[PDB]
Amino acid sequence: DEWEVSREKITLLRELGQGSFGMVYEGNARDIIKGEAETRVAVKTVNESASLRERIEFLNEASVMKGFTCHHVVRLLGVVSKGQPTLVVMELMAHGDLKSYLRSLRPEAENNPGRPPPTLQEMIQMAAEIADGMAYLNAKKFVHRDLAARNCMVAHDFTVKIGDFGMTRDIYETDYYRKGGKGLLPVRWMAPESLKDGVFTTSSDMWSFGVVLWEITSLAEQPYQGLSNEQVLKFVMDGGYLDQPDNCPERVTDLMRMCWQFNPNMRPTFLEIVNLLKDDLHPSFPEVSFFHSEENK
């Protein structure tokens, strides 16, 4: 309970957004980070009507974040387990989720900020940032299982980080996780072998990564638009895959192609992805990336 924090040190400000079985609030936390009086944070909660299965998932996300320390992974700050409601305190991602952010950039977007769509450059930055976060995850022997734009978060400075570890699993023992029973799965982002055998690996995460790239270059368009889940299932399981979005830079088109190889061992690794983009990145990258870290031995 080294992460436990007094419910008194927490103060909820407003509501940031509704989650599928909980509410995410913005708030203040006193003495949660040594050297800081109060820190603005995000606070995840569970609805009273939330099922056990959902509570376990909620507790799983917290549990796995405890072992993470990466600039490109949303950071866990503390937990309040003593008496309900339970609170998961993490770093505040000022610009919310990437999907929502990407849609704001659509010209027609009612909430369009005041800038054009991301630049090839800006996209490569996001891509490397996301890939770096995933590489750390993989290095720690965890498979995310739910990589998607809605689960990528944007910092006040627009740095993208990996978030939402509800479906994340420890694969230290076998390098893969196999789900046998029924369950809610993010089908449109799933690799073929996962849809068929329920097997998840860093390779299936890579497929999801390809789908995120597509999300980025299509400004969060809904993947496999038109098809229904069952159709998607069949489509992908039979060798299918998304089309290139409009004007999609070919370099990114190349990544997607590598991400969607039918055979998981044909797809690239997150480290390889970063290595392929290391040169064309913001100068600060080497100072924060997991890639250029001593940990990456």
């Binding site: 509704q18 599928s20 029973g181 369950g183 809610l184 849809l195 068929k196 055998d197 889940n229």
Partner: peptide, 14 residues
């Protein structure tokens, strides 16, 4: 608000 539709209740195929 949450993308509940992105998930499908299912079990592996074969």
């Amino acid at each position: 608000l949450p993308a509940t539709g992105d998930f499908m209740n299912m079990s592996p195929v074969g």
